[PDB]
Amino acid sequence: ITGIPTGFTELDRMTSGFQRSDLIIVAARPSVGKTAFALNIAQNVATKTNENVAIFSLEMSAQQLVMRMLCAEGNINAQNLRTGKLTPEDWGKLTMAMGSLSNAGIYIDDTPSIRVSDIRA
Amino acid sequence: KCRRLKQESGLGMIVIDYLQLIQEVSEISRSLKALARELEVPVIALSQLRPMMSDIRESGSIEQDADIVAFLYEIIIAKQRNGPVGTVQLAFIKEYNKFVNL
Amino acid sequence: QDVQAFLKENEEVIDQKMIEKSLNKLYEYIEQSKNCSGYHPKLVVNGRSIDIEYYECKKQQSLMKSMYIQQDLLGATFQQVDISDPSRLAMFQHVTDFLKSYNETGKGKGLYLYGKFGVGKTFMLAAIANELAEKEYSSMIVYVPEFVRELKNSQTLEEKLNMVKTTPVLMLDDIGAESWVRDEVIGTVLQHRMSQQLPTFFSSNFSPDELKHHFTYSQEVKAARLMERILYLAAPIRLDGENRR
Numbered sequence: 001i002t003g004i005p006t007g008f009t010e011l012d013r014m015t016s017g018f019q020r021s022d023l024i025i026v027a028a029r030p031s032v033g034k035t036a037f038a039l040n041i042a043q044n045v046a047t048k049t050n051e052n053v054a055i056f057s058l059e060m061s062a063q064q065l066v067m068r069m070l071c072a073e074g075n076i077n078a079q080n081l082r083t084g085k086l087t088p089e090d091w092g093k094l095t096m097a098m099g100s101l102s103n104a105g106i107y108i109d110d111t112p113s114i115r116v117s118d119i120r121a
Numbered sequence: 122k123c124r125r126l127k128q129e130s131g132l133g134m135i136v137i138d139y140l141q142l143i144q145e146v147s148e149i150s151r152s153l154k155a156l157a158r159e160l161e162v163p164v165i166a167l168s169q170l171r172p173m174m175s176d177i178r179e180s181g182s183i184e185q186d187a188d189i190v191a192f193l194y195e196i197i198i199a200k201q202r203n204g205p206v207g208t209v210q211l212a213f214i215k216e217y218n219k220f221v222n223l
Numbered sequence: 224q225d226v227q228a229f230l231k232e233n234e235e236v237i238d239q240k241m242i243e244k245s246l247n248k249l250y251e252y253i254e255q256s257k258n259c260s261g262y263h264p265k266l267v268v269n270g271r272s273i274d275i276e277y278y279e280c281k282k283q284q285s286l287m288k289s290m291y292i293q294q295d296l297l298g299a300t301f302q303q304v305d306i307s308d309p310s311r312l313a314m315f316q317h318v319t320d321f322l323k324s325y326n327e328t329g330k331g332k333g334l335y336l337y338g339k340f341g342v343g344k345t346f347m348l349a350a351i352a353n354e355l356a357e358k359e360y361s362s363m364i365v366y367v368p369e370f371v372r373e374l375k376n377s378q379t380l381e382e383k384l385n386m387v388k389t390t391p392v393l394m395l396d397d398i399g400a401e402s403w404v405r406d407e408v409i410g411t412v413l414q415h416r417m418s419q420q421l422p423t424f425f426s427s428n429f430s431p432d433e434l435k436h437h438f439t440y441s442q443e444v445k446a447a448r449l450m451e452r453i454l455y456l457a458a459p460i461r462l463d464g465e466n467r468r
Contacts, residue, residue, distance in 0.1 A: 061175035063200050078271070079244060082195050083208030087240035112179045216379060 004051075007044035035059060039069050046104035047073070053105035056119055061110035070097045124160065133162050140168035141180055150182035172197040225253035229266035229273070232391050235328025236268045236419025245273035265361075267389015268419055276386040283356035290387070291369030292396065296467075297349035304350070310342065310464030318351055325355075325392060325422040335457045336426035337433070343462020344426045348394035355392055362392040367409065368400045374408055384408065391421065398427040399434045402441035413449035423456045431459045 004019055006012040018024060018041075026041075028034040035057070045051050057065055071077030074097030079090060086093070109119075126132055137143075153164060168183070170176040172192035177183040184190050188202035196209040210223045226249035230237060242249065252264055252275050262277035279288070289297065301315050317334060325331045336344045348364060355362055365387065384407065387393070398409070416423065427434060431453060438446070 060173060061178070064174035080195065082197055083210065087243035089238070089240035090243075110175055112175060215381075 005044065005049060007040045007042075011041075036068060039072060042105075043069050043072060046106055047100050051105055052107075054107050054109065056109035058112070058114070062108035063110070065108050065110075066098075066101065070094060070101065073097065073100070127160055132160070135164045137166045140166065146181045150186040154186040174199050225249065225257065225264075225266070230327075232266070232327035233268045233273075233419060233421065235326070235330060235421065236416065237273065237328060241268075241271060241273060244271070248273055248275055251275070265386070265390055267385060269385065269389070274385070274389065276389045278361055278386055278390060281357050282359060283353055286359050287352050287356055287362050287364075289352075289364035289366070290383075291366040292345075292364060297346070297352055297364065299346045299349035299353060301350050301354045305465075307464040310462055314343070314347060314462070315350075318347070318354070321422075322355065327391065328420050330420050331422040333423035333456045334426075335431070335453060335460060336462060337428060337430045338461030339428065339463055341466040341468040342464045344428055345396045346467065347462065348396065348424065348426060351392075351394065360392050361390050362394060363387070363390065364394045365396060367395065367397045371401070371405055371408055375404065384411075388412070388415070393424045395425045396427075398425050399429050399437040400427065401437075402443065402445050403439045405438065410449055413452040417452070423452075425453065430461055 001012075001016055003016040006015055006018050026037065028037070042053050042055065046053050055065065067077070067081060071081060074093055076090060076093045076097065079087075111118075123132070123135070140146075153166065156164065166187065168177055168180065170180055170192075172194035174190065174192070174197075175184065176192070177190060184200065189198065189204075190200045191198045196211065198204075198208060199206055201207075212221050212223055213219070214221065226242070229249065229252070230242060249266065252266060255264060257263065259280050262279050264275050265278050267274050267276050301319050304311065304315070306312065306315070321331060334347075336347050338344065345364070345366075352362060352364060395409075395412075413425075429435075429437070434453075435446075435450075
């Protein structure tokens with residue numbers, strides 16, 4: 001801790017940043033859950049640890065990125081929450097999962113194979 | 122074989138097979154956009170890209186030239202303009218080539 | 224009304240939220256024809272979702288079935304059978320005492336009919352076949368040797384492992400008859416219902432210390448994944464009484 005955090009306890013371990021002057025890289029293989037991991041270096045640094053972050057997602061859009069962290073700190077990814085409505089034990093598992101999805105740095109960019117241009121400005 | 126078959130036999134549903142070959146691609150996606158005011162009656166299609174949303178947004182134009190955008194990997198139709206956002210849980214027979222009501 | 228029946232049937236397995244998740248199913252279940260003019264709809268719990276399977280169509284036979292045996296010699300019942308010795312002194316005590324404790328989902332423990340031929344393995348389940356009969360539940364008398372001969376060798380396949388698992392009363396015959404390959408038929412049946420729970424049924428010729436000289440080797444610690452689900456659903460019981468062959 002100096003410092004700006006990472007999210008995970010054993011990843012804020014040897015770093016403590018994740019600081020305002022370094023490029024950070026983490027990647028997986030075909031079917032290991034890649035952004036599934038990126039969410040949680042940003043989820044904290046949006047909903048809880050209050051800093052504004054613009055997810056300029058090259059892969060996923062903005063009408064798809066919603067679920068993977070409605071499912072994270074919410075545990076509603078088997079109901080299934082790929083569709084439909086809720087139960088007498090799930091009606092409000094989202095009152096603070098889609099209730100905790102804008103009180104955060106969440107202004108997603110959705111577009112495909114963009115050049116560096118329409119990102120920086 | 123569409124406008125002369127419109128005023129001859131019937132035509133209420135145009136039915137096609139898959140997209141990425143029927144002859145880049147962001148060109149002809151709009152070609153099926155200018156008909157919706159000309160012959161007036163629902164059009165259908167098939168395409169190729171897990172089960173996300175902006176994948177056929179890469180294989181043409183699609184998400185802006187074809188309203189409802191369905192997917193396959195439970196049809197994760199997370200963007201649609203005819204019905205509300207849902208996902209149609211469908212199983213298969215596996216031999217008799219039949220789709221089933223779950 | 225159908226939902227009520229199914230709910231209490233599988234209460235031990237079903238959760239309140241499961242009901243609301245499978246609402247569409249249970250509502251469609253009750254809304255459709257409960258009877259028939261060749262099958263009838265019945266609710267079954269499959270994992271976290273409740274499905275609707277069709278079973279083939281006083282009242283004592285129609286509400287009773289059997290899988291892979293003949294219905295000639297199954298004309299058996301409780302009470303009236305000429306009781307012999309400690310072979311049947313304590314056999315009609317746990318099939319009549321519990322004709323209302325086969326609880327839908329409220330642990331109604333089972334039996335395991337082993338021992339020797341012509342006396343007891345399958346007719347004590349033919350006994351329930353004409354006793355648990357008047358009240359309107361089905362009770363399918365599944366036979367083992369006759370199953371895995373079309374299922375040791377390969378029409379459809381992944382179909383009859385579910386209406387063997389979506390009805391309130393069952394009866395299995397001969398465990399251990401004829402890692403391994405007898406995999407997706409009988410082995411899974413034991414693991415499932417620690418999170419669902421009803422009255423379980425298996426039976427054989429081999430006791431809990433003899434069921435395992437025939438279910439085939441692996442050379443291991445890779446076969447006792449289904450055998451602490453018998454030791455906690457009955458008692459080490461056999462049958463040595465009277466020949467009826």
